[PDB]
Design an enzyme around this catalytic site. Structure first.
Site, PDB file in Angstrom:
ATOM      1  N   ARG A  15      10.997   3.664   1.461  1.00 18.92           N
ATOM      2  CA  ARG A  15      10.648   2.924   2.717  1.00 18.92           C
ATOM      3  C   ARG A  15      10.977   1.429   2.419  1.00 18.92           C
ATOM      4  O   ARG A  15      11.248   0.615   3.383  1.00 18.92           O
ATOM      5  CB  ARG A  15       9.170   3.267   3.190  1.00 18.92           C
ATOM      6  CG  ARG A  15       8.642   4.756   3.050  1.00 18.92           C
ATOM      7  CD  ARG A  15       8.418   5.347   1.577  1.00 18.92           C
ATOM      8  NE  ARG A  15       7.411   4.664   0.711  1.00 18.92           N
ATOM      9  CZ  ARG A  15       7.566   3.737  -0.280  1.00 18.92           C
ATOM     10  NH1 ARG A  15       8.756   3.096  -0.640  1.00 18.92           N
ATOM     11  NH2 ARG A  15       6.416   3.322  -0.850  1.00 18.92           N
ATOM     12  N   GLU A  22      -2.059   8.308 -10.581  1.00 19.24           N
ATOM     13  CA  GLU A  22      -3.394   8.947 -10.780  1.00 19.24           C
ATOM     14  C   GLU A  22      -3.274  10.045 -11.868  1.00 19.24           C
ATOM     15  O   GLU A  22      -3.839   9.896 -12.930  1.00 19.24           O
ATOM     16  CB  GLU A  22      -3.976   9.537  -9.470  1.00 19.24           C
ATOM     17  CG  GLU A  22      -5.482   9.329  -9.323  1.00 19.24           C
ATOM     18  CD  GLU A  22      -6.191  10.546  -8.703  1.00 19.24           C
ATOM     19  OE1 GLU A  22      -7.302  10.852  -9.183  1.00 19.24           O
ATOM     20  OE2 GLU A  22      -5.641  11.224  -7.784  1.00 19.24           O
TER      21      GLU A  22
END
Ligand SMILES: Nc1ncnc2[nH]cnc12
Ligand SMILES: Nc1ncnc2[nH]cnc12
Lengths: 178, 175
Positions: A66, A103
């Site tokens: 993006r 994560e």
């Protein structure tokens, strides 16, 4: 006029509950993208912020994917070239690579070793600043070429997730804050 | 002169991704301050010469976001991302395409287009046409129409154009 432009950009970002998992409010750029003036006004707002700050890059870098969208739109407005910072294994000639934490696990980004001249002051563009993991990997990548980071600019910043701290020592702008 | 300028910035890279394949590398074109605007302008000229007047641009993730955004800007149009799976947050349509081994998908938001839209697909390269055809099919699940497909590059003999039988296909350069 700047409040007015910023209000327009804000008015096209949807909030979507529970995506990509439960509890995450997803900030959705698609209505902005679809509007015929959406990208242009966003990139003009980015140029105005950079001008206010005295930041004058020589080239734009965007991460897959993006970063590609907003980076290309900004590059156009500034009359600059564009460099893609890609997922691994996609670029065809010699690359640098930088790993960043997820994560769970890790991942990498790459750039062509020759993507930037050593006199370049590179502007990083992306949609959204959250933890700042891919933004910092991008900065490291640029610095591997010996070019310098002029700054980083985002359409959005997520208040309190630490991205701006991760990017200490670099100029960071964000049009909207959530 | 314009096409020659664009060609001249697409580096030929032997043996990538694997021994035997000649890779066509858009990076130097993108880095040139006039590379993307020239490319987009050449695409817009082609579409006017063929009478294609789209209402919206759809770019294929991820290099179609590059050329799609650039051409959308020249056209004064909006932009719709056609995305790899699990990225778009609202209700989507999904279409499968074949990879070397197994398959993958492309998605669009079900609200990306209206029944009245005439959608231009943009991508960097037409090779087998797998992804481009999946895009056409996505489009058509909205009942909008495909106005056409345009690519920077087309690889002669890989069958892409033929997979896209029935649609208007343009490519700036053939390799
Ligand atoms: N909350 C969020 N919304 C949209 N994009 C994201 N990328 C990472 N977190 C996000
Ligand atoms: N041969 C090639 N060169 C550049 N991009 C491609 N995508 C698929 N084949 C390619």
């Amino acid at each position: 006029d700047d409040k007015m432009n910023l209000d327009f950009i804000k008015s096209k970002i949807a909030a979507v509950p529970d995506f990509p998992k439960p509890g995450i409010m997803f900030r959705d750029i698609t209505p902005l993208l679809a509007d015929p003036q959406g990208l242009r006004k966003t990139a003009e707002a980015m140029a105005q912020e950079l001008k206010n700050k005295g930041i004058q890059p020589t080239i734009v870098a965007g991460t897959e994917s993006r970063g590609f969208i907003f980076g290309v739109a900004l590059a156009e407005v500034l009359g600059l070239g564009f460099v893609p910072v890609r997922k691994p294994g996609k670029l065809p000639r010699a690359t640098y690579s930088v790993k960043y934490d997820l994560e769970y696990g890790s991942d990498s980004l790459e750039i062509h070793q020759d993507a930037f001249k050593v006199t370049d002051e590179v502007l990083v563009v992306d949609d959204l600043l959250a933890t700042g993991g891919t933004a910092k990997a991008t900065v490291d990548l640029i610095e591997k070429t010996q070019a310098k980071v002029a700054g980083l600019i985002f359409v959005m910043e997520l208040d309190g997730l630490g991205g701006r701290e991760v990017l200490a020592g670099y100029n960071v702008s964000a049009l909207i804050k959530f």
